[PDB]
């Protein structure tokens, strides 16, 4: 329930094929950009960086928790279903 990793914008490349190494069964790759992950302060910085580097991008809007009305006294409601049967 920690929110400290949802604060910066990320740039990740599309994942390519990983196969099994015939000798050891390791995960092989031929994708140089499989681990490349860039971090940005805003969406605009990320799109500018992607555009000047010529990378086609899709960017999705940041999803933040909506504000919620929390009331401890609702747990003991006189006539509402918010009353809890256990605590």
């Amino acid at each position: 329930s920690g929110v400290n990793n949802t604060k910066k914008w990320k740039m990740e490349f599309d994942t390519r094929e990983r196969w099994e190494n015939p000798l050891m069964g390791w995960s092989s790759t031929a994708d140089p950009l499989s681990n490349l992950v860039l971090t940005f302060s805003t969406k605009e910085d990320a799109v500018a960086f992607a555009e000047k580097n010529g990378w086609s991008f899709d960017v999705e809007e940041r999803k933040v928790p909506k504000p919620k009305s929390k009331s401890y006294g609702a747990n003991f409601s006189w006539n509402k279903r918010t009353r809890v049967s256990t605590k």
């Binding site: 409601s77 006189w78 006539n79 509402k80 279903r81 049967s85």
Partner: protein, 45 residues
């Protein structure tokens, strides 16, 4: 009638039974007011 602080006067609970309190409640249900209602039958309704 005279002052009698030389005797206990709480000897009734010596003859109480397992159902004395609940029988007293049963006989008390006679004269009570109608309970209030929250509208529903239970919070799960």
């Amino acid at each position: 009638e005279p002052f009698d602080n030389s005797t206990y006067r709480n000897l009734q609970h010596h003859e109480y039974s397992t159902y004395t309190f609940l029988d007293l409640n049963v006989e008390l249900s006679k004269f009570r007011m109608p309970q209030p209602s929250s509208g529903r039958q239970s919070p799960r309704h």
